[PDB]
Amino acid sequence: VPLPQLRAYTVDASWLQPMAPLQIADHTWQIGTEDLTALLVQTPDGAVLLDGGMPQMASHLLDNMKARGVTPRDLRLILLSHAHADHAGPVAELKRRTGAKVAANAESAVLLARGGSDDLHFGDGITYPPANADRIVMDGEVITVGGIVFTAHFMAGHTPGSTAWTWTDTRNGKPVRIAYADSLSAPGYQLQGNPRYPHLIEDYRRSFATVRALPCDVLLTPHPGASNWDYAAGARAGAKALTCKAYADAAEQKFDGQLAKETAG
Amino acid sequence: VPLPQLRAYTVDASWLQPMAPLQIADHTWQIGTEDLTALLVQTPDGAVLLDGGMPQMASHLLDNMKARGVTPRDLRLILLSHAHADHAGPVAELKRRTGAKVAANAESAVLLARGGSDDLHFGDGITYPPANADRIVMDGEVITVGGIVFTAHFMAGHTPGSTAWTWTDTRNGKPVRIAYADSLSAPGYQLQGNPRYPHLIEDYRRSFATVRALPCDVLLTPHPGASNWDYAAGARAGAKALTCKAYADAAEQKFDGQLAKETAG
Amino acid sequence: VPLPQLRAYTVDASWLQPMAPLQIADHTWQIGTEDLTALLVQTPDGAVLLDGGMPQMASHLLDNMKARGVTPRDLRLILLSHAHADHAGPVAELKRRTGAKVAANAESAVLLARGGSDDLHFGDGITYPPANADRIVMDGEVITVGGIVFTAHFMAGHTPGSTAWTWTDTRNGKPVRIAYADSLSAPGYQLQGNPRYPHLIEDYRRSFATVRALPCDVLLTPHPGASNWDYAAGARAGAKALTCKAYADAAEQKFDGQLAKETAG
Amino acid sequence: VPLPQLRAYTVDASWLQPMAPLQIADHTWQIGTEDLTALLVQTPDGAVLLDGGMPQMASHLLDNMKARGVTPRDLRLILLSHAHADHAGPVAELKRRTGAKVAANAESAVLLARGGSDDLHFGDGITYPPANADRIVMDGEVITVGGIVFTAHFMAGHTPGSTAWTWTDTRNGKPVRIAYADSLSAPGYQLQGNPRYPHLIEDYRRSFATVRALPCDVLLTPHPGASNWDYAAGARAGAKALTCKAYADAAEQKFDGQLAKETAG
Ligand SMILES: CO[C@@](NC(=O)Cc1cccs1)(C(=O)O)[C@@H]1N=C(C(=O)O)[C@@H](COC(N)=O)CS1
Ligand SMILES: CO[C@@](NC(=O)Cc1cccs1)(C(=O)O)[C@@H]1N=C(C(=O)O)[C@@H](COC(N)=O)CS1
Ligand SMILES: CO[C@@](NC(=O)Cc1cccs1)(C(=O)O)[C@@H]1N=C(C(=O)O)[C@@H](COC(N)=O)CS1
Numbered sequence A, B, C, D: 001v002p003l004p005q006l007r008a009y010t011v012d013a014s015w016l017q018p019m020a021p022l023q024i025a026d027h028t029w030q031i032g033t034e035d036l037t038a039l040l041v042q043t044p045d046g047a048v049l050l051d052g053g054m055p056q057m058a059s060h061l062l063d064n065m066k067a068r069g070v071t072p073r074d075l076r077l078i079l080l081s082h083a084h085a086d087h088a089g090p091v092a093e094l095k096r097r098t099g100a101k102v103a104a105n106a107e108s109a110v111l112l113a114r115g116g117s118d119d120l121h122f123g124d125g126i127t128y129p130p131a132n133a134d135r136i137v138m139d140g141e142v143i144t145v146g147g148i149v150f151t152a153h154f155m156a157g158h159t160p161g162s163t164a165w166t167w168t169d170t171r172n173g174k175p176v177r178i179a180y181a182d183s184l185s186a187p188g189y190q191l192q193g194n195p196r197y198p199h200l201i202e203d204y205r206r207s208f209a210t211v212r213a214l215p216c217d218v219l220l221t222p223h224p225g226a227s228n229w230d231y232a233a234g235a236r237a238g239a240k241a242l243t244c245k246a247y248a249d250a251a252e253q254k255f256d257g258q259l260a261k262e263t264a265g
């Protein structure tokens, strides 16, 4: 009986379904797939990308940037929600093919640098090409590109380095406070007494309160379904979107249910 | 007028004054210098080192390990209070010359990997040979060597990755709960509105409470003077040592004074 | 039409077929699978592993080490032929689970550190968990463990960092010069005018001459079939093995044929 | 007697003496100090920097780039002769303060990543802030920026990763083949039987022949004195410059003398 073959990280087809750029605000666009967020923020001083989705999405992202008028040299900065294969997958390749540098917190930087291997919960089951961070950010630190100010809000739990990124764009004339809040799921995680993450529960609890309080005229999430976006719905893609408060509440009620099921299991 | 010469990181002579091993408990020894802590914990399954002091202390540390019966192959694990040059200085060289692997949190790992460069407060003024961590630890995570259980307690502030390490040794027959608590100083730091560390004050405040609550029959600190140890005093080196509560209180009162002076300056 | 799913690196079943340890010489054992080499050299001062095969072979390797009397703490050193997924696959995990440190040349170290991603020929098609080298070796440099002396012989081509490792064991009473020569294949490679490897042909040519001249009483190769070993054949596993000269000649004739086919294609 | 204080890497004042930009060709400028080369190549598609000199030269380099019309965002690429503190010193800081990415061979990348520590000859005596390479180049590989084509020519010896960089600029109307050849010195090195560099002599010998053969209308070197440039001499700074052949011959005769002195010592 031979050892098992390596199993590829396969995902729902919608996660891999290319879409054209979808405008969120005056300078903010969804340029990923139908079910994975990849946000492009275009400034007079270069472009910012928040997440890239899966590893095989690099060329599609570059195609959509070109459609927006962003050449490789114009991409200056990559920010991440968290460093799992379905959100940071193409970062290494994007750095090779563009001018982009990566800013992340220390936890996300060390997970990115090992390509998602030795994951606290998934082991080596969900890996991707490693990449190095060019700048380490602290909680509450701001990064400014072309006068758009991005603020990091750590929300540890889904990964230790999970981060919400907030910035203010404009929509019609008016300012719109965008919150790109990270996943709050704990899929198959051991929550209680986890030796690799002893304070997991306390961190999730604190992260629910962080998300509740974000400046949040428009919430986006790495899996759009988590915040009730439908990127395939065109003009009403965002119509049903949750508030940050509703997203946090829904995630906490699910988390409490999982805790109770874990105690029973 | 030429640019200034590089300035070496020079320190008080006592920080560089070798001492023979000084026993703290049945399996725990101070093996550094008179004014820099480097703790050796000897187990039937290999030795653990907590800090190494300055970069030029590597050979002295190895000499003192040999005096204790610890060969290079026997050193299994290096733990750190924080990754500044005066505490992690010789880690790279020790890894090259021994069997030792490094365990640290993500923040300390990324500062160690850049040799203390791009420090949040010191810039490139205080650097040392970079080293890689072999294992990343989470807050409250335990590491066990030869049946001595080391628990990490994050106490961010002096550096983002500052850590207290606790373990239980024996003294005479009886269990002794040793707390190796990190520095709580903020020397020359900008405390309020620091763009590189926006939550600095809140982190220090939380770290005072962490130190206050450590299991703490005997407190040790990276600078022994901070906890009123006198390593040159032989049998009463530890006689005047502070409790963790007194160490935390003294550090918080100093911190409050610095905050007030900063507001006035 | 969604983007393609990630494709796993799947291999012939024999590459994943566990085997019990097979003795090559007094202190040298094949402990990998039927069709992937992983050599254990046991010394009174700890064990050396040369290659680990595929990423999923880590537990099997540890099982075979235990069968040989080598505990995790006893594994001191991992050496590599080259840093592709089918030979260095489990190195990251072995470092986490054992005392082992990795020694490699700079080229192999940088490919290992990126988990085989951005391969000169395979791109991101054949990746694995990244690992860091603890020691960088130069061509002709020796490493000594328990009095067995390992010499590195660079043989760039299959990868830039491809290395032959030689050492002298004993067999019956007599010294046996073992050559663990790396692959000399160029599978699907663009050989001529390759912008990522401009001197590829000259390096292969030099590497054929390096292999021809190795001290070589017994040749082993990462794919045993390349040197006509049959690890499933028991007492005559090595009976048909090639000399280093015959291995080099066969690889050069194949290489010349590929060059001619490339010119015609 | 305390252990010695750390000794700073101090250098001749002329190495630290700022100079205004000095034009070498239509798009190539010396922008370092009087006695350390730092070459800026300006293209319509961004700027390239070849070396930065000492760690404290970062702000001066940025000042001279601004004088040339190169903003931080416009610096796209840093190339290196070799990764010692007096040539790669400010690379980490330049990467933090500019858009620049680093391309280097594997040997230079691993020495840069450890900030010049664990040097084959200097140990930890000559270190600097570590930096990561963004692209690894092979011997003979070309990199193109704004239509200037840079070719790497490995010339191992002074360091394992020592590299000559060649490109063609224009001067008046006519093409000028510029060779930025690395140091060929071996200052205080053990040349024969060096366990950390067993093939040192053969590598130097091959590197003399590489330099002899470079396309070389104008030779520049990291220490301008090595090629008889005088950056303080204005219009005749380059008047006395050596050919690549004369530079190689002078370095080989010095090397042969050192070998003979080493045999006698
Ligand atoms: C590595 O990626 C994830 N796992 C998998 O893909 C596959 C799985 C492994 C173990 C349980 S599931 C993960 O991080 O668990 C995805 N990302 C998520 C997020 O919250 O970021 C969740 C999204 O929730 C749904 N059903 O859409 C679960 S799927
Ligand atoms: C980099 O090392 C430290 N700085 C210096 O050496 C030198 C300095 C730079 C800026 C202000 S001072 C640092 O971290 O600030 C030492 N370590 C300490 C700790 O708390 O770990 C403090 C100990 O307090 C005293 N007076 O003994 C201050 S000295
Ligand atoms: C990444 O691993 C290898 N590729 C594959 O597995 C699968 C392939 C990708 C592209 C062509 S094939 C590689 O390096 O090309 C294996 N290792 C080899 C060595 O020489 O090390 C060769 C062994 O030759 C045979 N037929 O046994 C080819 S298979």
Ligand SMILES: CO[C@@](NC(=O)Cc1cccs1)(C(=O)O)[C@@H]1N=C(C(=O)O)[C@@H](COC(N)=O)CS1
Pocket: D011, D084, D085, D086, D126, D158, D183, D184, D185, D187, D188, D222, D223, D225
């Ligand atoms: C680390 O830098 C160098 N060492 C020192 O600075 C100081 C020294 C340490 C040991 C011997 S000297 C080095 O690499 O040896 C400089 N760079 C050089 C090059 O060739 O790049 C040489 C230039 O020759 C002269 N006299 O100008 C020697 S000085």
Ligand SMILES: [Zn+2]
Pocket: A082, A084, A158, A183
């Ligand atoms: Zn995830």
Ligand SMILES: [Zn+2]
Pocket: A084, A086, A087, A183, A222, A223
């Ligand atoms: Zn996800």
Ligand SMILES: [Zn+2]
Pocket: B082, B084, B158, B183
């Ligand atoms: Zn400190």
Ligand SMILES: [Zn+2]
Pocket: B084, B086, B087, B183, B222, B223
């Ligand atoms: Zn200190």
Ligand SMILES: [Zn+2]
Pocket: C082, C084, C158, C183
């Ligand atoms: Zn291979």
Ligand SMILES: [Zn+2]
Pocket: C084, C086, C087, C183, C222, C223
């Ligand atoms: Zn192979």
Ligand SMILES: [Zn+2]
Pocket: D082, D084, D158, D183
């Ligand atoms: Zn040098």
Ligand SMILES: [Zn+2]
Pocket: D084, D086, D087, D183, D222, D223
């Ligand atoms: Zn030099």
